[PDB]
Design an enzyme around this catalytic site. Structure first.
Site, short mmCIF file in Angstrom:
data_model
loop_
_atom_site.label_atom_id
_atom_site.label_comp_id
_atom_site.label_asym_id
_atom_site.label_seq_id
_atom_site.Cartn_x
_atom_site.Cartn_y
_atom_site.Cartn_z
N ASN A 85 6.86 -3.43 51.39
CA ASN A 85 5.53 -4.17 52.18
C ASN A 85 4.54 -3.21 52.30
O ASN A 85 4.80 -1.99 52.60
CB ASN A 85 6.06 -4.84 53.26
CG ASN A 85 7.50 -5.50 53.24
OD1 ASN A 85 7.81 -5.97 52.07
ND2 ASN A 85 8.18 -5.39 54.33
N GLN A 92 3.98 -5.60 57.01
CA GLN A 92 4.54 -4.21 57.02
C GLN A 92 4.69 -3.84 58.74
O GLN A 92 3.71 -4.46 59.46
CB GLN A 92 4.04 -2.91 56.23
CG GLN A 92 4.16 -1.70 56.50
CD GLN A 92 3.52 -0.53 55.51
OE1 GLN A 92 2.46 -1.14 55.08
NE2 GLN A 92 3.65 0.68 55.98
N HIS A 98 8.35 3.36 52.74
CA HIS A 98 9.95 3.07 52.72
C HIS A 98 10.05 2.10 51.81
O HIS A 98 9.23 1.16 51.75
CB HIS A 98 10.53 3.10 54.18
CG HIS A 98 10.02 1.68 54.76
ND1 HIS A 98 8.91 1.65 55.58
CD2 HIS A 98 10.45 0.34 54.64
CE1 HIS A 98 8.62 0.33 56.07
NE2 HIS A 98 9.88 -0.18 55.62
N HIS A 100 12.91 -0.57 51.01
CA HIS A 100 14.03 -1.43 51.70
C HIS A 100 15.11 -1.63 50.43
O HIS A 100 14.35 -1.79 49.36
CB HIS A 100 13.53 -2.82 52.07
CG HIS A 100 12.91 -3.01 53.46
ND1 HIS A 100 13.68 -3.20 54.45
CD2 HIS A 100 11.74 -3.05 53.80
CE1 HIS A 100 13.03 -3.15 55.44
NE2 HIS A 100 11.64 -3.01 55.29
N1 LIG Z 1 17.45 1.86 61.62
C1 LIG Z 1 16.49 1.59 62.13
N2 LIG Z 1 15.36 0.91 61.70
C2 LIG Z 1 14.28 0.36 62.18
C3 LIG Z 1 14.06 1.28 63.63
N3 LIG Z 1 12.67 0.37 63.90
C4 LIG Z 1 12.58 -0.26 62.80
N4 LIG Z 1 13.33 -0.33 62.03
C5 LIG Z 1 13.33 -0.80 60.66
C6 LIG Z 1 13.21 -2.36 60.59
C7 LIG Z 1 12.39 -2.91 59.50
O1 LIG Z 1 13.49 -3.40 58.68
C8 LIG Z 1 11.60 -1.48 58.88
C9 LIG Z 1 10.36 -1.41 58.79
O2 LIG Z 1 9.91 -2.47 57.65
P1 LIG Z 1 8.15 -2.78 57.13
O3 LIG Z 1 7.98 -4.10 57.99
O4 LIG Z 1 8.39 -3.05 56.06
O5 LIG Z 1 7.65 -1.53 57.70
O6 LIG Z 1 12.20 -0.42 59.75
C10 LIG Z 1 15.03 1.67 64.16
O7 LIG Z 1 15.05 2.27 65.30
N5 LIG Z 1 16.21 2.04 63.31
#
Ligand SMILES: Nc1nc2c(ncn2[C@H]2C[C@H](O)[C@@H](COP(=O)(O)O)O2)c(=O)[nH]1
Ligand SMILES: Nc1nc2c(ncn2[C@H]2C[C@H](O)[C@@H](COP(=O)(O)O)O2)c(=O)[nH]1
Lengths: 112, 112
Positions: A85, A92, A98, A100
């Site tokens: 994203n 995002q 990153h 997914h």
């Molecule tokens: N494992 C983990 N994932 C997280 C944390 N905070 C946010 N995320 C994940 C949730 C989302 O699916 C992702 C960010 O996706 P995006 O919206 O494309 O930037 O990161 C965390 O503290 N731990």
């Protein structure tokens, strides 16, 4: 500068780690959208996929290769989906690059 | 062996081409799921993302770089989403490796 993924990287923030090398990190999503939902993040802290350059070429492919081999290890042979994203229309949230990785259930179309 | 994308590549099948180099093709989707929906496909005819190898490293990153620079050219600065589907749980239809690029509208979550 600092993001949530800074805290997962430096290990101060608890995360489920499936893989780590000198170039990237691989950890589960805390908000899983599929039975298996993990994130493939680089170590060079590129903010968005649109802010990547030719110097990151070999590193992006590596992130993709890491994602598919991590897809295998977690037994996704019946299929999965990779998602990158960008910005706000991309929806995002963390501004660290990153990939997914989602599988172990049937992903639909459109993909949002 | 042959896929739909064989016919788009060899040019026998009409397609909207936005970019072409020695490594890949970039063309619009005939079933657009967003105001801008194009596909970034390689020329080496890798079937799935899970059937890619270390020899394809530099080529995968290049496909990603091509996708984001093609995202810019089509005026997606407010955001977009890249998608690679694998196998059946991924809901893959053409078995040629391709990166979906979607933008110009707000993509939701989950991504299917
Ligand atoms: N494992 C983990 N994932 C997280 C944390 N905070 C946010 N995320 C994940 C949730 C989302 O699916 C992702 C960010 O996706 P995006 O919206 O494309 O930037 O990161 C965390 O503290 N731990
Ligand atoms: N432009 C164009 N796209 C096609 C044609 N046939 C299939 N497609 C597109 C539709 C799908 O969005 C995409 C395949 O996606 P996937 O299910 O991930 O393999 O290819 C065609 O003749 N022209």
């Amino acid at each position: 500068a600092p993001t949530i993924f800074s805290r997962i990287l430096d290990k101060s923030l608890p995360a489920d780690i499936l893989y780590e090398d000198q170039q990237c990190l691989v950890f589960r999503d805390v908000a899983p959208q599929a039975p298996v939902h993990f994130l493939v993040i680089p170590k060079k802290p590129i903010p968005r996929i649109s802010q990547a350059e030719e110097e990151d070429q070999q590193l992006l492919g590596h992130l993709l290769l890491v994602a598919k081999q991590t897809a295998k290890a977690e037994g996704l042979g019946d299929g999965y989906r990779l998602v990158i994203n960008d910005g706000k229309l991309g929806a995002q949230s963390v501004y660290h690059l990153h990939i997914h990785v989602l599988g172990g259930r049937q992903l639909q179309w459109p993909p949002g």
